[PDB]
């Protein structure tokens, strides 16, 4: 939004860059940060941990009703069956979309997101626009910002992660996909379908 007080983006980027490099040089000198630590952390969440992990759990739940029951009983233990877990997903609770219920997820207080199944969140999830309005006008927000019209008879359930319990949406299996492989099904599971801002892909 327009703010006549705010510097340009380029001016802001230059200033943060110099401030971050200043702090970095101090932590490095104090023994507590190193350049290998930075590359190791960045390389995990640029290359290893991402929404494809969560896609794996969704299609196993779609194609295996025993896993699905265990995934809804204890999401952390169930994801461990596929070797999926860890930082900021120590406590996961998965919630199932139905014909009657739609689930959508938020951290109104900051940016909590189930990293081990989804990776790091996109910036709009962490920013005040989505955070403020989802708990108050979910239906209009899903329509206007995501082109997803949820019928007024269908309950929208919004899950605010005020604690370390991380909430993940299990989206509905699209029609037209009987007998598809786990790899073929996996192409319909988006990051957005696991937040609840979109359904799984059609067709």
């Amino acid at each position: 939004t327009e703010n006549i007080l705010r510097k340009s983006d380029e001016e802001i980027q230059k200033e943060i860059t110099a401030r971050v490099k200043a702090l970095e040089s101090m932590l490095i000198e104090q023994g507590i940060l190193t350049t290998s630590m930075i590359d190791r952390m960045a390389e995990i969440y640029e290359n290893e941990v991402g929404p494809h992990l969560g896609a794996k759990v969704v299609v196993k739940a779609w194609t295996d009703p025993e896993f699905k029951k265990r995934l809804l009983a204890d999401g952390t233990e169930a994801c461990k069956e596929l070797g999926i877990g860890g930082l900021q997903g120590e406590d996961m609770m998965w919630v199932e979309n139905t014909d009657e219920v739609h689930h959508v997820v938020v951290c109104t207080l900051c940016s909590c997101y189930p990293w081990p199944v989804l990776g790091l969140p996109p910036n709009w999830f962490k920013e005040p626009q989505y955070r403020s309005r989802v708990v108050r006008e979910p239906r209009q927000l899903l329509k206007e910002e995501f082109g997803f019209e949820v019928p007024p008879s269908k309950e929208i359930k919004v899950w605010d992660s005020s604690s370390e319990m991380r909430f993940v949406v299990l989206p509905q299996r699209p029609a037209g996909t009987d007998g598809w492989s786990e790899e073929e099904l996996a192409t319909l599971v988006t990051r957005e379908s696991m937040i609840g801002v979109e359904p799984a892909k059609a067709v």
């Binding site: 939004t1 327009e2 703010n3 006549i4 007080l5 705010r6």
Partner: peptide, 13 residues
């Protein structure tokens, strides 16, 4: 108003 703008602008703005 933009609330960041509201919070730090001169009043008559």
């Amino acid at each position: 108003m933009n609330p960041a703008e509201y919070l730090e602008s001169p009043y008559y703005w």
